[PDB]
Each structure stands twice: as structure tokens, then as C-alpha cells.
């Protein structure tokens, strides 16, 4: 494979299909303090049409995390009557991205027309960075989907209570706070809430994992919620506080469109329902840069040296090990990203005044000698097969004398 480092994941559907399919890829490297770093991302989705293979190939083009957060594929080769409009690649922040596909519609180009039936097997995501390394993620579906093409009617519960408060959802995560219109006293408790997000041919249902609390605490009494769909790693839940109710359903997807409604049904035969409009914010909730630890290395002489330890303690004596380094806030993509090392690779050509070699135990030692009189930051990223990728912020600062 073109991939030099791949890791796999398992995706299973909880509840009924809400109308979209969601998969999260957290480990792709998004280099910090680099407003010029980009990435080439293709996606291949593997189906089975009649027990026979069929691949759909999609290209999202070049990613610009500093400017754009939502992407649609530029081209589709497996083909569909309109494959590109049914896909979305969204950045979630902190180096994480989510790929979304609209179920209940056929993205595959070839149909006998006797097989309306089609099942999703796995998803391959290809990630090429500035250094040219090919990162891949393989998302195996625990149970084959067998998706059915349909047009669900859009209904409106036109008896609920409109709220001035608006629900905003950012990086697929909805957040909203509502007041309480509940006659029963807090001590009565036995309060249950059910949420439904309707709009643009997809419905989302969220419920209590543990059911009704039956105990109200003036202090907040939290509660986990499960939402129909492919659940995100981010826990989804809410809280009702004696006086207000806050909810965070995680799988909320942009395919709902604008002006979609969130319905909140609550009880405790007296029952109530509150509806609220939802809007999809276009700004990333936090920096897309991957988390990076900062280390201070002091040099009293122009030569300086840092040691890159083994990555994340995983795959000691790995088959593939890759170490990258570049200067903070680079301006030119054609020269600033040449400092790349591998076990087989020797001294890189375009790397200037930086040297590195793999000592026994793979302690990669970098000689950054060449700098002087200026506090400069070197961004070092190391990876290995089946070993999460770490990036180090190494600050080189001049020291007046030895032995302090």
C-alpha cells in the first residue's frame, strides 16, 4: 500500500440508522505553529453489491485547516447519480477529523437495479502531509450495513413550546440550555427527557442510558445519553439542575441543514415538550493543531542537541520509524519540510544545519547546530507502525555559561 503507517478502528451502529453514517479519525498529524501546512486527503469506501466487490473513490483535494473546516469531495470515481453531495469531511479540532456519509441513498454508480440492496464493508482514508508521508486509517464496519434507499418524510411536532434560546452545534457537538416548566416538585423527581433532532431527511433520537433518575439533587445530577447513530468517542450527556436542563448530543451532523428543529420531550399523566431551532456554526471550536508538548533545551554554544525518545511506548523495535522536524512558522512549502528521517533513509538532501541518527534503542538524537543568539522552536514529530504519533515543541535558548 502507498501507506507507510496505518491503524484500524471498528465502527458499529447503535440503535436505528439516523440517516447519516459517521466515522472519526483522530490520529492524523496536524502540525502546530504552521499556517502554511496542508494535506492531500482521499477516501475509498468499500462495499459489496451482490457479494461482489465495489469500490467508490473520492478526493477531497487539499486541506487548509487554518481557513476551511468543512470539505466536500471534488470528484467521485466509484460513481453515483450524485456521489459528491452525500459526503462531508469535517475537522473537529485538536488534529481530529470526521467523515460523514448520508445513508438511505445510493452512492454507488453501478446497479443491476435488482440489487437495490447494498452493504458498507470498510472505509479507507488516505492522508498525505507536507513531508510527503502517507498516513492511512482503516475503519471496519462491525456489522455490514445493508443500507436501503429511501425518502423519509419531514414532520413537525406542532404542539411543543418554542424557545427563544437557540441550540448551536460545533464540530458535530450540540450544546443548549433550557429552563424548566415542570409542575412536580424536585423531590418528586422521576423526571425523564427524550430528544429528537429532525431535518433534511434525517432524524436523531437520544435517550437515557440508565432511564429516569427518580432522584433530583439541588446540586446537578448528571445523566448519560445515547443517540441513535454511530456514537462518537466524545461522551454525550446532559444535566438538569434544580432552580435548568443542558444537553450535549454528540452525533449531530451538518446534513440536518439549517433551520432544523431539536425537540425535547420531558415528563414528571402529565407530559411536556420543548422545541428549539438548531444552527451549525462554521468556526472550529478550538485550534485544529494536534496537541504538542513543549520542552526547553539550553545551549551555551552554537551546537545544540535534543533526544527524541521512543514514541508513546508502543512498537519498540518497530519495522518503520519516521522522525520529522521543521522550524516554527515556516513560510515556504518547497524548502522548509525536507528534514525527514527513517531507519532506512540516510541524511536528507534539503535539510540544512540539522542532523539526526538513530542510536541503539532508537533514541533519535538531533543535532540542531547552526543557530545562535535567537530563541527558536523546532517542531519534532515521531511515529512508528501501530504507535500513536507525538509532536514535540523544542525551544532552543542560549545559555551564558556552562555548569550554571
Amino acid at each position, epitope marked *: 500500500l502507498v501507506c507507510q503507517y496505518t491503524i484500524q478502528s471498528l465502527i458499529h451502529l447503535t440503535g436505528e440508522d439516523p440517516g447519516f453514517f459517521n466515522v472519526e479519525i483522530p490520529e492524523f498529524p496536524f502540525y502546530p505553529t504552521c499556517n502554511v501546512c496542508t494535506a492531500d486527503v482521499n477516501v475509498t469506501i468499500n462495499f459489496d453489491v451482490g457479494g461482489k466487490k465495489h469500490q467508490l473513490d473520492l478526493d477531497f483535494g487539499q486541506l487548509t485547516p487554518h481557513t476551511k473546516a468543512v470539505y466536500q469531495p471534488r470528484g467521485a470515481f466509484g460513481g453515483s447519480e450524485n456521489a459528491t453531495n452525500l459526503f462531508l469531511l469535517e475537522l473537529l479540532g485538536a488534529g481530529e477529523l470526521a467523515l460523514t456519509m448520508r445513508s438511505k441513498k445510493l452512492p454507488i454508480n453501478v446497479t443491476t437495479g435488482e440489487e437495490q440492496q447494498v452493504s458498507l464493508e470498510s472505509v479507507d482514508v488516505y492522508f498525505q502531509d507536507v513531508f510527503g508521508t502517507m498516513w492511512c486509517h482503516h475503519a471496519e464496519m462491525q456489522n455490514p450495513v445493508y443500507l436501503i434507499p*429511501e*425518502t*423519509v*418524510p419531514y*414532520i*413537525k*411536532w406542532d404542539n411543543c413550546n418554542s424557545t427563544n434560546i437557540t441550540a448551536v452545534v460545533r464540530a458535530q457537538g450540540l450544546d443548549v440550555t433550557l429552563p424548566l416548566s415542570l409542575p412536580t416538585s424536585a423531590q418528586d423527581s422521576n423526571f425523564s427527557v427524550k430528544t429528537e433532532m429532525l431535518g433534511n431527511e434525517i432524524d436523531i433520537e437520544c435517550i437515557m442510558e440508565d432511564g429516569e433518575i427518580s432522584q433530583v439533587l439541588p446540586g446537578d445530577n448528571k445523566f448519560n445519553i445515547t443517540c441513535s447513530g454511530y456514537e462518537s468517542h466524545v461522551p454525550s450527556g446532559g444535566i438538569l439542575t434544580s432552580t435548568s436542563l443542558r444537553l450535549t448530543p454528540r452525533p449531530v451532523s451538518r446534513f440536518l441543514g439549517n433551520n432544523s428543529i431539536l425537540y425535547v420531550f420531558y415528563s414528571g399523566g402529565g407530559d411536556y415538550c420543548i422545541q428549539s431551532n438548531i444552527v451549525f456554526s462554521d468556526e472550529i471550536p478550538a485550534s485544529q493543531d494536534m496537541p504538542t508538548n513543549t520542552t526547553d533545551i539550553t545551549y551555551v554554544g552554537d551546537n545544540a542537541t535534543y533526544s527524541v525518545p521512543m514514541v508513546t511506548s508502543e512498537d519498540a523495535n518497530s519495522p518503520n520509524v519516521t522522525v520529522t522536524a521543521f522550524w516554527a512558522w515556516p513560510n515556504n512549502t518547497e524548502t522548509d519540510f525536507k528534514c525527514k528521517w527513517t531507519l532506512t533513509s540516510g541524511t536528507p538532501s534539503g535539510c540544512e544545519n540539522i542532523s539526526g541518527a538513530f542510536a541503539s534503542n532508537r533514541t533519535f538524537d538531533i543535532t540542531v547546530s547552526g543557530l545562535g543568539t535567537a530563541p527558536k522552536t523546532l517542531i519534532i514529530t515521531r511515529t512508528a507502525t501501530n504507535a500513536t504519533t507525538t509532536t514535540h515543541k523544542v525551544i532552543f535558548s542560549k545559555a551564558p555559561h556552562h555548569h550554571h
Partner: antibody
Amino acid sequence: QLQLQESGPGLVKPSETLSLTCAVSGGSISGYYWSWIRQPPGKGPEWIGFIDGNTVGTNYNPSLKSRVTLSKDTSKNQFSLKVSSVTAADTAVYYCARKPLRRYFWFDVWGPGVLVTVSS
Amino acid sequence: QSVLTQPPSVSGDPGQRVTISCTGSSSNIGAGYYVYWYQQFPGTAPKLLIYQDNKRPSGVSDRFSGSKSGTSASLTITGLQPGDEADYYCSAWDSSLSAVMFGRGTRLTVLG
């Protein structure tokens, strides 16, 4: 063997309020959705609206939203209907039917239906 | 009262097959929304005949089948029997009306 039985007055004066009740036996209101369909003689069925069996949720035909109210009593295992400002266009056989699934709109089990006539 | 277009009545020889056509628009049936068929003997509640375009409830005979291709659906009766004389109504949801639509209806008559 879930059965639906409609009840209510057979004659209502114009501009008054029509009111019926559907009694469900052999099954539970909870877990399903419940709808009202009317059919004037010689014409086809017309959908009115449905009520959620587990929430307060109601959906109405926009052509009748102004004058129609749907309610349910989980106790007594029944749900009701009310039509306001009834006219000669409102005389029909009224059917109460179960809507088994919320995503899709079909009615598997119906009641026998009760005729209501609107006349002075 | 907007309606889906149906033939008022269709005729058929016993033991043959006849077709009943339900025609809609891009708002209801052309949009891909599901089509439903109901059978109604005189003086009785409609009986769900075909649900989900072509699916058959447990009990309905295999002689009944459904089709949806295009902006119009179709209900087929094969091995036509005298007991099939009834009223047949199609149903589909309309996105432009936000309501469930029913057809004009069709009277099935057995010839000979």
C-alpha cells in the same frame, strides 16, 4: 388481536365541535402511534393527524390544523379527537387507526368507523 | 382536498391480471416517498394491502404486488378472482403539502 373501537355522536349541528374517542383493546397505546382518518361517502380517505403513544407529540394535516385537536389517555387505553366549526364538508365516516412506525406513514389496523353527519 | 390520480374503475377477465395506476407529482411520489395501497370492501374499513412500495403484510395473497418506478405507482392483481371486487386506494406523503395524500380510488369489476 388488537382492536380499535370508535365512539361519539352521530349528528352534530354546524359550527359546533365534533368529538370522538377511540378505544384500544388487546394492545397498548405506548410503543405505537395513533392516527385519525375520515372518509366522506363516495370519496376517498382524508388524513387528519396522529398522536405519539409515548409523548405529547401531535402532527396535523395543515388543511385542518386550525380546528383539530388530538389527545390521548394512556390510562383507559384510548385516544380522542375534536373538530371545531364543523360544516357540511365535515360529515364523513371517521376511522381511528394505528400508525406502527414513526418514520413511515401507513396504518395497518383500523377501527370499524363511525358515521357523523353535520346538518341543521 | 388534493388527490393522487387513479382510474375510476378497471375491468378484468377472471383468472387474468389487471393493473391499477396511481399518478402523483415530484412533490409526493416523484420525490421517492413510499407508496401504500389499501383495499376496501363496501361498508368496511380500508385494509392495508401493500406497504413500503412493494411489501406484503402477513395474510395478503401473493397475487397482489406493487411497483413505483417513475412519478407513478402501480398495483397488480394476478389470477383475478370474483372476491377481489372492491375499492383500491393508493397513498403517498407529499412534501409540498406536509400531509398524507390518498387517491381518487378505483372500482375493480370482474368481467364475465
